[PDB]
Amino acid sequence: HHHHHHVAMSFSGKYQLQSQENFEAFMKAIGLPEELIQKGKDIKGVSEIVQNGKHFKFTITAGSKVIQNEFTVGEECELETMTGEKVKTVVQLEGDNKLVTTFKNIKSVTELNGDIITNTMTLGDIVFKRISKRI
């Protein structure tokens, strides 16, 4: 389907988990089983994001399970979580390579930075944080 007008700073590629902070507090705060927390911290995860204009895929694989999400920025779309719940929410984008979406009181923020993907999720007082890099 050609180059389809190539755009710079697109969230398009594949990224392995480097590290993560407040994982055990956050994965407990959403209510995943304590075995899947204590093993899933050492299971090396991967994410695979695809910006297609206003459309966005967000794939995440960790703990031997896969999550796929689809949304479109400026529109309302149903985002799936680690617990398997789906909730409707609007996603926003800023002119600094950032995304923002809020689901189940989990205030997710993402940022593309060259080849590196930063993620943060703030639920109540738990400030979860995530670091991934291009593979």
Curated annotation (Swiss-Prot):
Residues with Phosphoserine modification: 19, 47, 64, 108
Result of altering residue 102 to A: Increases the binding for cholesterol; increases high density lipoprotein (HDL)- and low density lipoprotein (LDL)-mediated cholesterol uptake
Signal sequence extent: none
GO biological process terms, semicolon-separated: cellular detoxification; cellular response to hydrogen peroxide; cellular response to hypoxia; fatty acid transport
GO CC field: cytosol; extracellular exosome; nucleoplasm; nucleus; peroxisomal matrix
Recorded domain comment: Forms a beta-barrel structure that accommodates hydrophobic ligands in its interior.
UniProt-recorded name of the protein: Fatty acid-binding protein, liver
